[PDB]
Amino acid sequence: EHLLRPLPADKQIETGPFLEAVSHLPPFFDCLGSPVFTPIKADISGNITKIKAVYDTNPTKFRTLQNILEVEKEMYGAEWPKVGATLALMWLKRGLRFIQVFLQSICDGERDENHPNLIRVNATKAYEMALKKYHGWIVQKIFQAALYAAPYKSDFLKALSKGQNVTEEECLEKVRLFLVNYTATIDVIYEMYTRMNAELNYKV
Ligand SMILES: CCCCCCCCCC(=O)O
């Protein structure tokens, strides 16, 4: 119902099914009514839309994520990889990695024992690992505001089990299952960017 597809032997990720799966992730930022972590949500959603626009023009040409990078490298020459869907996916993977590290941290029981019902330590770890190195001073401040406003852990978990009779432990089990194919997929995308020399280090 929103699991990602398993990783193929050949590690070639199909573009259409990938976009379909990750487009179910922005709504989770809305599970508490007022959206949470809005700058992270907005970037994920905006980058999905950009990649989908390129894919939809020629699904066979852009059948896999690797095809996008191959095709755009040829099309755009020296401007690549700072172009098109290659650039949108370079940023998308960092928002997807934020979600991965955040959810894994919560599932692993990582917390500040003085604030066991907050998720600030999990969100900070995820931000540091995924996004911080690529954000200038102004953008970092925009993220800290989203940090101070983070929901309570119990409210965040209640809201993921949208109106179901499921315990916090049962909810965490479901997130752990989701994390298996999701983490593998993000790791393969990162490895592709490094292999293809598509990764850039500029800050926004
Ligand atoms: C129930 C397994 C799927 C969990 C997906 C949750 C995505 C959370 C996005 C966020 O960090 O706000």
UniProtKB/Swiss-Prot annotation:
Top-level taxon of the source organism: Eukaryota
InterPro entries found in the cross-reference section: GLTP_sf, Glycolipid_transfer_prot_dom
Cellular compartment(s): Cytoplasm
Tissue expr: Detected in brain, kidney, spleen, lung, cerebellum, liver and heart.
Residue positions binding a ganglioside GM3 (d18:1(4E)): 43, 47, 135, 202
Record keywords: Acetylation, Cytoplasm, Lipid transport, Repeat, Transport
Secreted among keywords: no
Region entry 2 X 12 AA approximate tandem repeats, spans: 40-61
Annotated Pfam families: GLTP
Gene Ontology CC entries for this record: cytosol
BP terms from Gene Ontology: ceramide transport; intermembrane lipid transfer
Gene3D superfamilies, A to Z: Glycolipid transfer protein
Record's function text: Accelerates the intermembrane transfer of various glycolipids. Catalyzes the transfer of various glycosphingolipids between membranes but does not catalyze the transfer of phospholipids. May be involved in the intracellular translocation of glucosylceramides.
Family of the protein in this entry: Belongs to the GLTP family.
Protein name, per record: Glycolipid transfer protein
Native source organism of the sequence: Bos taurus
